[PDB]
Design a protein around this ligand. Structure first.
Ligand code: FBP
Length: 319
């Protein structure tokens, strides 16, 4: 499957390019719809027998890249697919930094199927692999990570979604003497920073999308870091109890129990993962698309769990 790595990077490049057309145009859903459409089109020309496992939603409210959709030419291997055609849709609509197009491809059955609900995440890179456990308190995890990283706590840097749900815990960490990078959106890209040496980020902690968590699980596994997650029902996080109760019903069926700590391998089950991400706007991880005349440029991160060549591909496209 390593011959397909380039094909997959083309899938994100094309989703990025299509989402870029809608940058700064104040329309979340048209930008997203364009990226989705372009990603599906590209994936349907790749020689895989793909099943969308993480995607735009159920068949009833997502016509494209719905959960269980078959993609690819059907030649090649049966593979699980996680798509996030635009991570940072609001940012794309507003012309802000950190928008990117995301894809992960793995072995059949490789990715946890969990509902579109919230997940508490704790993520670190290779130097702190094995030092984390979400059953312990945050403070304990943080000291353990700092100690394994070989730095004082006060030097430790934690990134976290800047959201109301997170005020209490951001205070607790600042009080504890930790540097807190609060980001507006995008915990998929931010989790990868834990494994990028020239990023000051050591740790991602906090509650974001469950499907995003499973994509971070896959790439974090590929990069040999570590992650724990914990599914949480809407009302435990924020008539939320209405949607929170179907999430728990969906959990029983799926069949997983919320509130239990997922280890790395509970979410990303093998090392055979190809991860691809292409920047739409510039961010901590990737350069944005530039476009002068009939010539556009993209930067793509391409990671394959079987190895460690981490690839950054700078493409010059003649449209
Ligand atoms: O905004 P919420 O509801 O707190 O969701 C958090 C999730 O949204 C994201 O920030 C993506 O944002 P977008 O929905 O604008 O694409 C993810 O990175 C994160 O997991």
């Amino acid at each position: 499957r390593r011959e397909l790595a380039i094909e997959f990077s083309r899938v994100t490049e094309s989703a990025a390019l299509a989402g870029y057309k809608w940058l700064g145009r104040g329309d979340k859903n048209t930008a997203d719809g364009a990226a989705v459409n372009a990603m599906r089109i590209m994936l349907n020309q790749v020689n895989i027998d793909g099943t969308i496992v993480i995607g735009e939603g159920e068949i009833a409210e997502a016509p494209m890249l719905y959960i269980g959709e078959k993609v690819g030419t059907g030649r090649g291997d049966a593979v699980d697919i996680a798509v996030d055609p635009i991570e940072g849709t609001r940012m794309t609509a507003m012309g802000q930094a950190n928008a990117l197009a995301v894809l992960a491809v793995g072995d059949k059955g490789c990715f946890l199927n969990a509902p579109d609900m919230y997940m508490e995440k704790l993520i670190v890179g290779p130097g702190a692999k094995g030092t984390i456990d979400l059953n312990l308190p945050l403070a304990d995890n943080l000291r353990n990570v700092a100690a394994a990283l070989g730095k004082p706590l006060s030097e430790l840097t934690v990134t976290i979604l800047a959201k109301p749900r997170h005020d209490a815990v951001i205070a607790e960490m600042q009080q504890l003497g930790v540097r807190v990078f609060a980001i507006p959106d995008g915990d998929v890209a931010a989790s990868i920073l834990t494994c990028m040496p020239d990023s000051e980020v050591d740790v991602l902690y906090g509650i974001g999308g469950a499907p995003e968590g499973v994509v971070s699980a896959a790439v974090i596994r590929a990069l040999d870091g570590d992650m724990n997650g914990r599914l949480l029902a809407r009302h435990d996080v924020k008539e939320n109890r209405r949607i929170g109760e179907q999430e728990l019903a969906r959990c029983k069926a799926m069949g997983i129990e919320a509130g239990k700590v997922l280890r790395l391998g509970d979410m990303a089950r093998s090392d055979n993962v190809i991860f691809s991400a292409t920047g739409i706007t510039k961010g901590d991880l990737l350069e944005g698309i530039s476009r002068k005349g009939n010539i556009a440029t993209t930067e793509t991160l391409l990671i394959r769990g079987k190895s460690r060549t981490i690839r950054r591909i700078q493409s010059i496209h003649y449209l």
